[PDB]
Design goal:
homodimer; alpha+beta; Arc Repressor Mutant, subunit A; SH3 type barrels; six-stranded antiparallel sheet; two-stranded antiparallel ribbon; 8 helices; 8 strands; binds manganese (II) ion; DtxR_MntR_Metal-Reg (chain B); transcription (chain B); cytoplasm (chain B); WH_DNA-bd_sf (chain B)
Chain lengths: ~210, ~210
């Protein structure tokens, strides 16, 4: 699916500045690298990408921003109107993104009150194409003593979203790092809650929580 | 394609007994008579269909596609401000990229509806079709009564027209000629105005006596 590639390339560049090899595309889009190379070759001919490493052109940016907007407004609509949880929305909107007309997103956007962020805090690009990215970094990238408000949680693993909800790490929850033990991949944080509990996040969980220091 | 096929065979035999030929699928869906048979063969190679006529496992798959389409048509009008003449072509597209979990929550949010915005019966999850006992208005005689049950959606021009005069599901109609020479029938609507409908218009209005 050609549209999946532009959205994936853009989401990879959203919180990192590395490279998106054709092998990175294949394993996350979900198809063999044999066809991903044959795929990514096509979009470069259409003037959408360029590639070694792959990048977005200007026609690919406005096209990927469109795909991201539909995906993320659909996730939001499934939670706020249809009763999904935040771990059930990504697989649904991953399929619904290629069958929706601009008219439907307009009424979805209008009924949702024009939301700017996901159930995961993922920024929803505007129709004009601005993108409201919050100024955040991963919890694992922080150091001892730092505080912050959870602003965005990755949805690559629905189990991890389930784990976060069970202990009390939601969007807008305030954390402080107590003991970051780089060896061996453990970080202790204090959730600012009513009874004020304390949890021990492993290295992968902390690399999924983006936080805003304020 | 291939779910659009099965859906069309069932919807064709829903209000008539005229049967389906490989070409008539090509004029409804949109393809050549050549490819039309090749798309039919793989539904027949699966045991979903054997003058098309579907089998038990084929009726079940078509009833699920019909249910998805009409639940979408209802969700669009009731939740997202669509008019009944805008939903078909859009719901014609969503029906292939929707999960059964999403349909169930749409179904539950709509209150478990039996009819869609056009009065078309919405099949149950197990294939329990709630067919209403209706006949074409053009088949009535002056002067029977009857509530409108189903209105055809093959043309959004007709639905847009019906809504303009005041014709919509549940409205009671009374026939007062009944003028074939004139190619139209006059009806009283109570809910008291007088409206004249041509033969093609009254042919897209199924009604339930008294
Ligand atoms: Mn997502
Ligand atoms: Mn997708
Ligand atoms: Mn998201
Ligand atoms: Mn329809
Ligand atoms: Mn269809
Ligand atoms: Mn309908």
């Amino acid at each position: 699916v050609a549209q999946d590639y532009l959205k994936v390339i853009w989401t990879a560049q959203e919180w990192s500045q590395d490279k998106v090899s054709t092998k990175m595309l294949a394993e996350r889009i979900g198809v063999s690298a044999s066809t991903a190379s044959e795929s990514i070759r096509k979009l470069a001919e259409q003037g959408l990408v360029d590639h070694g490493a792959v990048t977005l052109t200007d026609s690919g940016r406005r096209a990927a921003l469109a795909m991201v907007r539909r995906h993320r407004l659909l996730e939001t609509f499934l939670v706020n109107e249809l009763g999904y949880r935040w771990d059930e929305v990504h697989d649904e909107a991953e399929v619904l993104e290629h069958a929706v007309s601009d008219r439907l997103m307009a009424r979805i956007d209008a009924k949702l009150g024009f939301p700017q962020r996901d159930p995961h805090g993922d920024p929803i690009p505007g129709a004009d194409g601005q993108v409201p990215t919050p100024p955040a970094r991963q919890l694992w990238a922080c150091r001892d003593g730092d505080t912050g408000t959870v602003a965005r949680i990755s949805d690559a693993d629905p189990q991890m979203l389930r784990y976060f909800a069970s202990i009390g790490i939601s969007l807008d929850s305030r954390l402080r790092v107590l003991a970051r033990r780089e060896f061996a991949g453990m970080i202790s944080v204090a959730i600012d809650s009513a009874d004020g509990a304390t949890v021990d996040l492993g290295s992968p969980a902390a690399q999924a929580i983006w936080v805003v220091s304020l």
